[PDB]
């Protein structure tokens, strides 16, 4: 089997991407944030505290003839941005782009933190990291990909995120028309539960490539590119007037600037992020200070190849017995 679904930016900045997902019988379609940095499929629901729902579409398990309470199971998750959610668990039929999994754990939110409530466009998350990170207790549950894997034509999914435009998540096949050149594959460590790999270096603009190992995670659920402070300083030094602002929470730059590109290495291959992809717009409405799309990871504990980086590539998440990641230009 295969599946193919379009993913759409939630706003004009590409702050996140939503993908329609069918849950239950008859189908209830919710727009989920596909997150290769986590491993829970959770949704706003008829059980979510009413004051914490503001415009999201909810899953109502009592209206699904295939929903079954997973008795005794609870979940609770905290994300790197400080947001969180928790609740109980149903199993139900879940379909993405024509690919159907029966018995998928659908984690129903009883509580969500303010940032989820405040984002009316995201109805939940669909985790695509390794199932060892799934938070369901006392019986850990498998991701949608893990459940689908054995049925797929090939044990892979691909992320093809657009810049200011829709893109595609494919399951079970590699669309050879969706990228240019060849796909360069690189090793993955699953020891932390992430799609963790080592970039071979970077360049700023037309500058020379610096060969240096950068361990980080391919994370579709993180907006920006978070890299070591040395790398990020080298980038922003090429932008007149750019500075790190403790009050704003990162590097800002004059909105009048033209940003240089940023290149990252994948083995001997190179992925070029155009300068425009690094512009996240005014820090507040009407400001002439703009927020940068490359930020320091120094406060995180891990480097994160988020959407800013991934949207410059066609990315293969290869879930073979020994997982690997593939990157191609497009």
Curated annotation (Swiss-Prot):
It catalyses: Hydrolysis of proteins with specificity similar to that of pepsin A, prefers hydrophobic residues at P1 and P1', but does not cleave 14-Ala-|-Leu-15 in the B chain of insulin or Z-Glu-Tyr. Clots milk. GO terms for molecular function: aspartic-type endopeptidase activity. Disulfide bonds join 255-290. Residues 17-328 form the Peptidase A1 domain. It comes from the Eukaryota. Keywords: Aspartyl protease, Disulfide bond, Hydrolase, Protease, Signal, Zymogen. Its EC number is 3.4.23.22. GO terms for biological process: proteolysis. The keyword Signal applies. The lineage of its organism: Eukaryota, Fungi, Dikarya, Ascomycota, Pezizomycotina. This is Endothiapepsin. The chain holds residues 90 to 419 of 419 of the full protein. Belongs to the peptidase A1 family. The active site is at 35, 199. It is an enzyme of class 3 (hydrolase).
């Amino acid at each position: 089997s295969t599946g193919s679904a379009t993913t759409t930016p939630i706003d004009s900045l590409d702050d996140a991407y939503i993908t329609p997902v069918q849950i239950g019988t008859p189908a209830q379609t919710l727009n989920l944030d596909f997150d290769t940095g986590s491993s829970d499929l959770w949704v706003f629901s008829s059980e979510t505290t009413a004051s914490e729902v503001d415009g999201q579409t909810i899953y109502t398990p009592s209206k699904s003839t295939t929903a079954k309470l997973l008795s005794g199971a609870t979940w609770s998750i905290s994300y790197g941005d400080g947001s969180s959610s928790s609740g109980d668990v149903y199993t139900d039929t879940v379909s993405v782009g024509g690919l159907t999994v029966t018995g998928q754990a659908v984690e129903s939110a009883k509580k969500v933190s303010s940032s989820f409530t405040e984002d009316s466009t995201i109805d939940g998350l669909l985790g695509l990291a390794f199932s060892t990170l799934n938070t369901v207790s006392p019986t850990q549950q498998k991701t949608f990909f893990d459940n689908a894997k054995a049925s797929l034509d090939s044990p892979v999914f691909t992320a093809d995120l657009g810049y200011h435009a829709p893109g595609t998540y494919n399951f079970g096949f590699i669309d050879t028309t969706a990228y240019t050149g060849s796909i360069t594959y690189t090793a993955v460590s699953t020891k932390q539960g992430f799609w963790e790999w080592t970039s071979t270096g970077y360049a700023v603009g037309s500058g020379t490539f610096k060969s240096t190992s950068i361990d980080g995670i391919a994370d579709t659920g993180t907006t920006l590119l978070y890299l070591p402070a040395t790398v990020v300083s080298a980038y922003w030094a090429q932008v007149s007037g750019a500075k790190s602002s403790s009050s704003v929470g990162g590097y800002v730059f004059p909105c009048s600037a033209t940003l240089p590109s940023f290149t990252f290495g994948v083995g001997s291959a190179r992925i070029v992020i155009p300068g425009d992809y690094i512009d996240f717009g005014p820090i507040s409405t009407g400001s002439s200070s703009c927020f940068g799309g490359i930020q320091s990871s120094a406060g995180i504990g891990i480097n994160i190849f988020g959407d800013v980086a991934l949207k410059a590539a066609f990315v293969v998440f290869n879930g073979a017995t020994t997982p690997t990641l593939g990157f191609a230009s497009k």
